[PDB]
Amino acid sequence: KVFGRCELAAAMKRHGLDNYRGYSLGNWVCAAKFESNFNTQATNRNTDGSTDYGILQINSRWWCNDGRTPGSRNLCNIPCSALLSSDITASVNCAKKIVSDGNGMNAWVAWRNRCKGTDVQAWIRGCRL
Ligand code: NA
């Protein structure tokens, strides 16, 4: 599924991501934009052989099982395929664990490089929330 901007902002808010670990909703929408262009089916292979999955490009090195990332963990206790669902519940629940891991949203290199310190509220401007 390719979410609309305000559609994804509403889905993230309903799942409690708005101000989770102090990160306003526009931070999460900005990260999803640059990670996946709001596409739940987004995948990216990393140099190390791990894969990033879903709207927030969650990686198999630590967070999900895809059976093809040697030495990896599955800390969200999900198949990585769950992160490609039209239902963002698995992505959101696993994002909460990631952002709680110590480095906050710096875990998402695209958030650090393209969202952090910007006017992220523009990502929810005009959304009925
Ligand atoms: Na894994």
Which run of H or E residues covers position 112? none
Neighbours of ion ligand 1 (CB under 5 A): 60, 65, 69, 72, 74
Q: Specify the amino acid at residue 95.
A: A
Q: The domain containing residue 83 runs over which residues?
A: 5-124
| 110 in a structural domain | yes
Length of the chain: 129
Q: Tokens 């889905």, residue?
A: 11
Q: DSSP for 12-62?
A: HHHTT-TTBTTB-HHHHHHHHHHHHTTBTT-EEE-TTS-EEETTTTEETTT
Asked whether 52 and 58 are in contact (CB, 8 A), the reply is yes
Residue 129 lies in a domain: no
Fill in the DSSP letter of residue 81.
Answer: G
Maximum pairwise Cα distance, the chain: 44
Q: Any binding-site annotation on 48?
A: no
Choose among 94, 27, 23: nearest CA to 58: 94
The residues facing 58 across adjacent strands are: 53
Contacts of 28 (CB under 8 A, 6+ apart): 12, 17, 18, 20, 56, 95
What does DSSP assign to residue 4? -
* Residues pairing with 92 in the sheet: none
Long-range contacts of 34-40 (CB under 8 A, 24+ apart): 34/110, 34/111, 34/114, 34/115, 35/108, 35/110, 35/111, 37/2, 38/2, 38/3, 38/4, 38/5, 38/8, 39/1, 39/2, 40/1, 40/2, 40/3, 40/83, 40/84, 40/85, 40/86, 40/88, 40/91
- What's the gap in Å between 36 CA and the centre of ligand 1? 20
Q: Is position 108 within any domain?
A: yes
**Considering 7, 18, 35, 87, which one is annotated as catalytic?**
35
CB atoms within 10 A of CB 86: 9
Look at the chain and report how many structural domains it folds into. Answer: 1
Task: Tell me the technique behind this structure.
Answer: X-ray
Q: How far is the CA of 42 from the centre of ligand 1 (A)?
A: 17
CATH of the domain at 58: 1.10.530.10
- Is the distance from CB of 69 to CB of 50 less than 8 angstroms? yes
Cα distance between residue 53 and residue 46, in whole Å: 11
